[PDB]
Design a protein around this ligand. Sequence first.
Ligand code: NI
Length: 341
Amino acid sequence: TCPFYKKIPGTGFTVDAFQYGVVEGCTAYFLTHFHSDHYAGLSKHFTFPVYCSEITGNLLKNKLHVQEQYIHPLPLDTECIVNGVKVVLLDANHCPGAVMILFYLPNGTVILHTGDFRADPSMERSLLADQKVHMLYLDTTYCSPEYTFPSQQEVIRFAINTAFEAVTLNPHALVVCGTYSIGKEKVFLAIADVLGSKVGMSQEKYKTLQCLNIPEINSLITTDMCSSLVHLLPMMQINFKGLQSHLKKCGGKYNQILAFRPTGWTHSNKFTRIADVIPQTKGNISIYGIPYSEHSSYLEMKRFVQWLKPQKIIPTVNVGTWKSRSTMEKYFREWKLEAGY
Ligand code: NI
């Protein structure tokens, strides 16, 4: 049955609630972004109205074969009317096409649902600045003070520098980047850009990327693996056995693999600066875990909430244990006390 934190009170709306069958009372289904824990249940047989961004709509049509008459894409940063209720979609700084959703209830209540987001001060100058928010449905994925991580820009600098140095020293090295969903595209694209290569990948992953409006993408990606020195592979293949096998498949074109596994967080962040990160090596294979996050750090999340000053916070992540819920509620109280709302 649909959990309560996926239901918008005073409307016929749900958010990311497609794995429950027909939700009793539901007149429109919102989808924040194209990741499988959120879309699980959409297909060509779905015949309710789905509201989402343009890019998420492109992916629904092409990857899942949802029929076009049921897809209702909305422009960002624009007041739109859905079943008599004013709504606005805002950039969530998560993966391509990911949004937050502002709802303006008929009774005057204002609700923000973050979806998955990485808070940023640029958000403090969107249509959020212009009115009060009564309820916040918050992506709390890393709501504990141990979760620190660097900016995306510092992680990309590290990756570009590492790869440019390895290939300059050995022009027969192959660079590999792991992936399992959309998101984190800047990793493999920035590396390709510095080496003056295109990124080679499967036809299916190429198709996915062509759905994302990314300008000059024909210029950065390809399915001709042979002409590329940056290959994208399944995340499950980013291990010593998997990359040994891939290297054999390259026909003696390359004699060394440098691989990157972007990840959310790892405990090494508690002890280690980005500059100090080192690979796991075996034979002619090195694997770098890099802390490229598309969710808020604890301190980014705290700043956002203390800026917004909501009257009630409803967590959407880590809600399944009493100890987690308790812990998050204690931080919310502190934030409120410290900020004086
Ligand atoms: Ni996500």
